[PDB]
Amino acid sequence: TIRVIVSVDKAKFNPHEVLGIGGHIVYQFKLIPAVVVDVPANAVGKLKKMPSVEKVEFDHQAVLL
Amino acid sequence: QPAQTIPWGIERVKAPSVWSITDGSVSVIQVAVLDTGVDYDHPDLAANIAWCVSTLRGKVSTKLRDCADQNGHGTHVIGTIAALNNDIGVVGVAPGVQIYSVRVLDARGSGSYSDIAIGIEQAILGPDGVADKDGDGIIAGDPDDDAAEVISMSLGGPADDSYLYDMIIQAYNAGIVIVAASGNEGAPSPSYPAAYPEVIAVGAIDSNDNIASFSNRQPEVSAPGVDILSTYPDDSYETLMGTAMATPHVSGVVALIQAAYYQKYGKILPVGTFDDISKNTVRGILHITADDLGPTGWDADYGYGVVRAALAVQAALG
Ligand SMILES: [Ca+2]
Ligand SMILES: [Ca+2]
Ligand SMILES: [Ca+2]
Ligand SMILES: [Ca+2]
Ligand SMILES: [Ca+2]
Ligand SMILES: [Ca+2]
Ligand SMILES: [Ca+2]
Ligand SMILES: [Zn+2]
């Protein structure tokens, strides 16, 4: 399973849709239209296929400076 | 506990002379520090810790246990901003400012962008979980809200993601000053998020006023970042270097500016832009009152120069 962050169209998105592709919601942002979700690695294409999903981004790493 | 010393960096940014006007202890003012967490009972920091939260693993927890510093970096950073002016340890740039410790990095000092974004969202929302309670568009500087006025990020990565940038935009629009470390790879430009226009990228100088060979170039301003003594777990002190140690010096200065301005006028200053050279915004003030090192004007090593609290506050109030 991988963690990714999807930018969504709020007019078409509903957190319950994620379970259909095998995934689950980790965190729904309150201040931007995006959700953190965990999905199987082979489910990334299906998310992309969803009309509510406008962009899927991998979860990148930051380090202390 | 050792007797109090004023670290060379606090001296260099000209903070001690500001303290008669304010030490940052103006009620509406909070600084959010997105880092490894904090030694929350450290005798030289406790009284200034207003909120401790964690966003690790996409899970927002305010359990002290989950928010505690397991690396040390966060405790050090926080100490540079807000170590208490007393008889022990060290002293911060703004020794009475309230701190929000938002733990977005884990024991290893690495973090997910998702967690950090969540961290910025929490700095905006505050303990009450609502950005703008009374719905007037004012967030930072609104006494009815609990948002932080400064977001301090001593961390970075090479990726530019749209959700993280959209959250940065939300913070800026909430009137929050965003400050971040330029990076420690001697690179030509800053890491993210310091490289976004909404954020103040900070490079590191050493004690002879030279730029650190590791400091990522083209910052906005620069600050003490080599041999910086501060608080460190557990209830102790340590000396470190990095653009991470510079960053909090700048955040401290901002805190004092906003605190002094609110105290006189009961409002805060707009955040401003990079090109700003007026006295009418935070970033403008920071830029015109910076100690201009190296070549005249903004340059690739020091930015506009070394931040100076004494002068920034005078410019804000006059
Ligand atoms: Ca506030
Ligand atoms: Ca002290
Ligand atoms: Ca709030
Ligand atoms: Ca408000
Ligand atoms: Ca209000
Ligand atoms: Ca402790
Ligand atoms: Ca210069
Ligand atoms: Zn999961």
UniProtKB/Swiss-Prot annotation, chain B:
Stretches that traverse the bilayer: none
Residues annotated as coiled-coil are none
Q: What does this protein do?
A: Has a broad substrate specificity with a slight preference to large hydrophobic amino acid residues at the P1 position.
Give the pH dependence of activity as annotated: Optimum pH is 9.5.
Tell me the GO molecular function terms. Answer: identical protein binding; serine-type endopeptidase activity
Q: What is the lineage of its organism?
A: Archaea, Methanobacteriati, Methanobacteriota, Thermococci, Thermococcales
Presence of the UniProt keyword Protease in the record: yes
Where does the UniProt annotation locate this protein?
Answer: Secreted
Cofactor(s) the protein requires to work: Ca(2+)
Q: Partners and quaternary state? A: Monomer.
Q: How does activity depend on temperature?
A: Thermostable. Highly active at 80 degrees Celsius.
Report the sequence similarity comment from the record. Answer: Belongs to the peptidase S8 family.
Give the active-site positions. Answer: 35, 73, 244
Its Enzyme Commission number(s) read: 3.4.21.-
Listed under GO cellular component are: extracellular region
Q: What is this protein called?
A: Tk-subtilisin
According to its UniProt entry, the protein's GO biological process terms are: proteolysis
Give residue ranges for domain Peptidase S8: 7-313
Give the record's keywords alphabetically: Calcium, Hydrolase, Protease, Secreted, Serine protease, Signal, Zymogen
What domain of life is recorded for the organism? Answer: Archaea
